[PDB]
């Protein structure tokens, strides 16, 4: 259900209060396609409705059927169209990526949320959920594990959200992990295994093998954190979705420093292939240090492939990666360049807290 | 024809809640078809706009192909349809002179007023006028200038709803002169009229006029009386309301109570004359006991049209009749009839407090 | 539990707010006397209790106890204050015969009921009854059984309120009386009088059965009132207190008008000692109109002692007697001071809309 | 002794929770005492009131006979003490340092505020701030930022409140300088200093001129920090302060970084000598640090006072002294050592997300 939609619904709003007749109907008729699917959105469907409705009141021939100066349904119509433009728009701004406009918007639909009349106790989970996500992003972890166990406290209670408390419950090991506290991330995202197993759900299964191989990995055990990375390639079919990009990286990352370079490669292969198939600079970048580390060896590279992960923000991997470097290039012996890297690495840290 | 949609609108909403497709088509196009008239009501285009949705959402559904399962404005549209559903109620049964029923329907209205989002101070003076008014009708006077000052305190306030302001202190006018405080009344109609002609109004004037006229006329002051009747014809072209006979009854009653028989005549010719162009029955009848009283007496003839104001429940005019009557035929001499008429004019007030519904 | 103290508190009040020590020192020992008997009142020593903490906060020394400019809690005593002001001057207004001030001050008191947090449905009751009261001392009788059926309402609900149910219908009844719809007020009270039977209350039944009485007499039937009259007098010791004179009188007048003179005049007699044993004036212009009517007669002294009922207000009691005279009068054949009393009679009536 | 009180005031609430006359007298009697200093706490004050009044309810009775079954101001009385109950449960967990669990005692007392009479928008305002604040002790400066400024315009509106306005625009500043958005922090800085101006302020300017004095000295500019160094120690007599040791100690570093040992060895003696005055053992090691590597290098000496700062969880101030370290070491032309301490400035990054209570 793209958040295109309430961009739509929200520039409509806007069209509606300057008086434009004619980009109105324009923006009501895209709309009013999109949604005819099957079932996608309440929230969507009735701010059609109550902004269509409020369309009427200024464009339709009332001249006959009466003059609608500003009549008493007036006021909780604008209190529900302010909600639902908050909503939508902060769904939007999450959307480009704009997280710290979009805890904005939520936070005043938030506000909203007691004057509307018969507010269910789901509604208050999801903007929880939304903006604990949301802090997420801009690594606001300990306020992002207070919201988002907000919302899962809601989600436990009754049994007909036990998707969403699965989801949750991955939300809070990540920023655990994020942290650094292992063993606590390790323990949520091992309860939401066996939530997910006891239902028949398989869409969060592959995040959550993903999400223990990254644990186990940052433990030390190399070992166990292969099993998980392949556990993770196994359950769902990835290879032709963007998003299972980041295990197969994981693959041959790992089959890499535990000296595999057989197998490595072969990941390598396909993480490369992968990155053609859907134009993927990043993950081409961060397979290329790979191959230009492990397989054919080149300092020059590897800092061109690099620069282009620092142009791109992506700091965490820019730490880790250059990290990762300076340590290998130390028992090589070579500390002139290690030392090189390290500043690298450091510098990205630092570009962990200013998030701009 | 203004509360009768309201019973229209609510019946609708009673079709929609036993799922009736049919008879909710039904009247859902009467009443489209009857508000097409210019006649300022927001609240019954509010109210059909919010039956027509949820008539939709129950027999159309959209012709979208949604999911329309409880939404979030759901919770809020109830809110609304309940109120304009007590609201109109109350409107109607005011029209069918069931007050009390009224009062009931009003009060509960009242009451979900409070739990709804930018409402502005005068839709709560519009409850405490239409209940003031209500009880104003059942002759409970003391809790109608009670509820129709709390109104006029909001109206005063916004200044731009003073038209308002100008009617609620004619009510408590009224009310006051209805239980016999001449002097309250006097210096709240007199308050009403300085500041209808220091603003831009008409309306009014007239009514103002008449109740100073009537005021004054129980004052027994009846040359000034008779002056502010006079103002009151004068004030407005009456000769085409039907609610502007009652000045030209009061004009040929005064002038008969004073000794001014020729000049009287005249008006209870137009009065008679009025009472033709409109089927008012009251105004004839009470025409005519002036017509058997001071033109060609006739004791049997006063006491039949008499007998008909009885018969409509209008104690307070009947109560007033008879006095005059037995206060006449005293100076006259006739102590026989006029002890007749003054147990008329007391069983009329024991009348005033016994009110069914 | 006299509604001199609820002024005297008031006044407690107002001197507080004047910032005055020495009389409010003086308020506070004549009322803290007052109320040290065994159970007297909730709101009252509540209201003493906020006012003696406010008084502490103007006049004791603190100076080595905080500077409370206006802390926290002021909004909520505040609350209470204006509330239980508010509600105490109602019942003083109510007690000096001023029931169009004490509906205003009740009314005032009635609406902060909302804002206090845990009020319980009788405190809504409470002021439904009292203002339904004062608007029954004013003749609105529609309004004052739409209040008190309020009350009664709440009260039937809980059954440890049954005595105010008792009295709350007692009081619908008496309204249905004085409008004149004798078989409505004849149900009502026939209702309250069961109520008190299957209880132990004897309070109310005096009442009810005086009640009772007066229904059939307005009836006409005569035989019927008189015994009700009689069980009156009979339930309850009246004979000493001040509101039993009344049932004397009713006694005494019914016999005079069934030409049983020989016990009426025999009530009268006690109904004159009693207007000695408590200066009641108005109880002995009443008697004396008995006395000069159907013992002595002497149309110049009846018209004496109507002129004092008449300088008294007291119009209902006004309009009914003349009336009678004028009715008996009639019976002896003189139309002319019946006409003379059947105008002061009407005029009588007229005073009834009035009510200054 | 502020939040202490709050802790033997919600004690005192446990004790009379219990029905325990004897342990309730005790520290009824303790507070009474204690709260006899003059220092600016109305909500103590009203607690303690709140408390005895509950208190002779439960022990005392009056003295008087009354009745005193639940009352009507029991219910109101009720919701103040579970408030100040959970606000100063929440100032004494920030006093332990227990950061998250005086947010949660905030959040909790924060809801309560919202259904109690005559409330001022500023005790939301002070809600903002404390969690706000206490956000900062943590390092979520995002956060931060978003609720002290809810804060500010509150504050802003008044133009009563500038005081805290000033202090909030203070806060919002240093979450933007530890992030690392300098010049965001430094336009933040400014405008808290012309407002601290164009009113009579001297209390906040000091702390204002240090931060600005910080700032750029992150931002390299040293000329311009060390200006505003100098203006902190001058605007307030700091040498009694105990935390105007920090001016101190900047003075130094700065004077080191640049080329004036001279000078930055005066100050590092009068912060040594300011180490002594109070207990404080970070700035000991702080400046030992400083003499160690500017005046008598030993780099193991370094390594103690730095491993004793790691031992405090002072990471952002141990990533940065490290960091310091390092580069200087090099321009040294020892690599070795400089990929010692850049190794540790780079873990000590790590220890700052990492944070347990």
């Known amino acids: ?62 001249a006959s059927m009466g003059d609608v100066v500003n009549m008493l349904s007036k006021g909780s119509h604008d209190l529900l169209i302010n909600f639902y433009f908050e909503l939508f728009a902060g769904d939007y701004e999450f959307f480009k990526k704009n997280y710290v406009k979009a805890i904005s918007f939520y936070e005043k639909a938030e506000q909203k949320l007691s004057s509307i009349p018969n507010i269910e106790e789901t509604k208050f989970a999801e903007f929880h959920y939304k903006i604990g996500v949301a802090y997420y992003e801009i690594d606001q972890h300990l306020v992002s594990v207070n919201k988002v166990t907000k919302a899962r406290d809601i989600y ?26 292992l063993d606590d991330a390790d323990a949520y995202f091992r309860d939401a295994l066996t939530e997910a197993l006891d239902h028949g759900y398989d869409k969060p299964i592959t995040k959550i093998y993903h999400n223990l191989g990254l644990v186990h990995w940052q433990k030390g055990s190399l070992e166990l954190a292969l099993h998980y990375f392949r556990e993770a390639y196994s359950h769902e079919w990835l290879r032709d979705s963007p998003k299972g990009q980041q295990t197969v990286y994981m693959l041959s990352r790992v089959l890499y420093t535990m000296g595999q370079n057989e ?56 730490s880790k990666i250059a990290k990762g470097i300076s340590e290998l290039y130390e028992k090589k012996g070579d500390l002139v360049t290690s030392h090189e890297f390290l500043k690298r690495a450091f510098y990205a840290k630092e570009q962990i807290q200013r998030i701009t």
């Open 1 to 62: 259900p793209s958040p295109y939609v309430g961009n739509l619904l929200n520039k409509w709003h806007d069209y509606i209060m300057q008086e434009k007749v004619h980009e109105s109907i324009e923006k009501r008729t895209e709309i009013k396609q999109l949604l005819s699917q099957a079932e996608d959105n309440k929230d969507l469907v009735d701010y059609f409705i109550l902004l269509d409705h409020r369309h009427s009141l200024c464009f339709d021939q009332e």
């Open 156 to 181: 436990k209670k009754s049994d007909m959200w036990n998707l969403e408390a699965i989801q949750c419950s991955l939300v809070v090991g990540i920023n655990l992990y994020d942290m650094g506290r």
């Open 263 to 318: 197998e490595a490669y072969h990941w390598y292969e396909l993480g490369i292939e992968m990155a053609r198939k859907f134009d993927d600079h990043e993950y081409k970048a961060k397979h290329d240090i790979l191959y230009h580390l492990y397989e054919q060896p080149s300092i020059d590279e590897v800092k061109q492939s690099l620069a282009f992960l620092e142009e791109r923000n992506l700091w965490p991997d820019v």
